[PDB]
């Protein structure tokens, strides 16, 4: 069963390549020893990124792990070759980035062009219905409740990227969506596991206005109330209509423990959820649309921490926004990307 199986991951803001040790219950970094670009592309294809490959180099291990994985100097799949070595010869572990992501417009309300190049508007019947985040030239992260029946068919959806104004999303200009995959454990009753993937029929052309956001790795080591950003065409006022122009705002993460308080959401926040906003209220984080991006800046990289899931009203006290926890979905996303190609 694919869920029971795992293998490989990227850990931390420095993309430390980690392999799981059969029967030892543990992750181990990889020695730079005899590593090259081909091995990095192999690991990326193992994670489901296909021919995508950005960089691979040697960095210092900051995870504090027990042992490393060193490829047998010559054993003749090279995957088994990696045995439990106590140290690396090159004194360096493998940093591997499979795709150029997390970069936007440097600092220089209404969103600026290129400020959120991963933001996409998802339309049905020529009308902006949801938002999403670019992760590959052909893959978009959104919410599962956006694509529930009867919108589970990919032919209902068109994606618009690099465009800030809805009025400038004309009939014909958006990329057709080929596949829609809801999370298998999505529960519309509780909005648990509210995440879905859209694969486009045609690859996006990346530029200053259209770029992907990095998927979050385990061990990001974010602050308890880490400052994050939300963006979208979300109605600023309740019951309001879709904002014509793209907007963005800053929010702070809210501890899940504090978010599950009785006088907040009273144990409705699951491990598949994170909370963000402001508890006291009065702060307009309503700009975001459902499935839109929740991102944070760490190690000078923009990471997708959450996708807009649910929330009682908006800018309401004791009712912060609840987002899907992309960190716990990154493996499922990798699996879906690998199973496609």
């Amino acid at each position, epitope marked *: 069963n694919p869920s029971n199986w795992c293998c490989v991951r990227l*850990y931390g803001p420095n993309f430390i390549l*980690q392999v799981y040790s059969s029967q030892r*219950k*543990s*992750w*181990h970094p990889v020695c730079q020893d005899d590593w090259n670009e081909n091995y990095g592309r192999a690991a990326c294809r193992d994670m489901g990124y296909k021919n995508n490959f950005y960089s691979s180099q040697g960095i210092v291990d900051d*995870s*504090g*792990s*027990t*042992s490393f994985m060193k490829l047998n100097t010559s054993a003749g799949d090279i995957y088994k070759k990696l045995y439990h070595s106590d140290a690396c010869s090159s004194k360096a572990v493998v940093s591997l980035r499979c795709i150029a992501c997390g970069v936007n417009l440097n600092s220089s309300e209404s969103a600026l062009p290129g400020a959120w190049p991963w933001q996409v508007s998802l339309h049905v019947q020529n009308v902006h219905v949801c938002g999403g985040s670019i992760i590959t030239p052909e893959w978009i992260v959104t919410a599962a409740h956006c694509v529930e029946k009867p919108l589970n068919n990919p032919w209902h959806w068109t994606a618009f990227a690099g465009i800030l104004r809805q009025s400038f999303m004309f009939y014909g200009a958006g990329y057709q969506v080929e596949k829609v995959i809801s999370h298998p454990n999505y529960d519309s009753k509780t909005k648990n596991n509210d995440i879905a993937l859209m694969k486009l029929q045609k690859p996006l052309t990346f530029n200053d206005l259209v770029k992907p956001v990095c998927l*979050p790795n*385990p*061990g*990001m*080591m*974010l*602050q*308890p109330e*880490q400052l994050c950003w939300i963006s979208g065409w979300g109605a600023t006022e309740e019951k309001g209509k879709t904002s014509e122009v793209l907007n963005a705002a800053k929010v702070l993460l809210i*501890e*899940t*423990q*504090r978010c*599950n308080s009785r006088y907040v959401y009273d144990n409705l926040i*699951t*491990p598949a959820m*994170i909370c963000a906003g402001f508890l006291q209220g009065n702060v307009d984080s309503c700009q975001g649309d459902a499935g839109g991006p929740l991102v944070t800046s760490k190690n000078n990289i923009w990471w997708l*921490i959450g996708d807009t899931s649910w929330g009682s009203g908006c800018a309401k006290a004791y009712r912060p926004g609840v987002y899907g*926890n992309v*960190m*716990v979905f990154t*493996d499922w996303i990798y699996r879906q990307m690998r199973a496609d190609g």
Partner: nanobody
Amino acid sequence: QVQLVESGGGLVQPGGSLRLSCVVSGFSLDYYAIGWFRQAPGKEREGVSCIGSSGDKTNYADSVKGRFTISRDNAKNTVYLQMNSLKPEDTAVYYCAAESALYSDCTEEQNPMLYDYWGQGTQVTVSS
């Protein structure tokens, strides 16, 4: 439903050993750090040990450093705390708690507010 279930507590002689176990349900250990905390009678809850989502990162408070040992079984979704050379000072209610991996896996000082999910705990008393 997510549950954390502690067991293995009991009454033991000073210098004895115990093995606490914590069964985790509702989420994967690959994305969450698991800590053992203890609360003495009428004292604040203090961090005892921590194992990260990677399984290699382990941290221990100086009061039990080198005497206790935390471990995890991902296949069994069970975290074990081996308490060796138990002292009367170790008498407390031992709780199992889970924190996400978005934040730091294991800290030197275990902040109980970073841990989002809690079990009911098991009583450990170390006396003659």
